[PDB]
Amino acid sequence: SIMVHALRAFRSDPGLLTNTMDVFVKNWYPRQKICYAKRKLAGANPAVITCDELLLGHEKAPAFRDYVAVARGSKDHNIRAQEPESGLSEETQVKCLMDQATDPNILGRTWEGWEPWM
């Protein structure tokens, strides 16, 4: 619920931060990642951006088909998977962003050193 109160304060006015984040005048990896930032500050889904990243050239690694099937989850029992891609309220946005972070089927296949068990 603290994230309800936090993300609402940003999502309400997407210009203020995204327009500042055009500081990357320094394709342009800036344009194509800010293209995603403008979507995710607006109503867009967290797993969708992960699929969208994996589609963005990383489709050369063989498990990309499966990486998307981990990101998209199972429509039977993952609470992200039933939602649309875009137009999400602060509730739907964060409700799903929980699921895509807490997934035991992500955590059960991931980097050591970095640490799901701590």
Resolution (A): 4.4
- 44 beta partners: 86
CA-angle at 90, arms to 12 and 98, nearest 5°: 135
| Residue whose pair of structure tokens reads 């807490």 in the numeric block | 102
Q: At what angle do helices 2-11 and 90-102 cross, to 10 degrees?
A: 120
- 86 beta partners: 44
Q: How many helices and strands in the chain, by DSSP H and E?
A: 7, 0
Q: Please state how this structure was obtained.
A: cryo-EM
**Cα–Cα separations (whole angstroms), residue 105 to 21, 25, 56, 88, 117:** 33, 39, 23, 24, 14
> What span, in angstroms and rounded, lies between the C-alpha atoms of 72 and 46?
10
> What span, in angstroms and rounded, lies between the C-alpha atoms of 86 and 72?
14
CA 35 to chain centre: 13
> What span, in angstroms and rounded, lies between the C-alpha atoms of 65 and 110?
17
> What span, in angstroms and rounded, lies between the C-alpha atoms of 102 and 43?
21
Q: Are 80 and 94 in contact (CB under 8 A)?
A: no
Question: Per DSSP, which regions of the chain are E strands?
Answer: none
Residues 6 or more apart whose CB falls under 8 angstroms from that of 20 comprise none
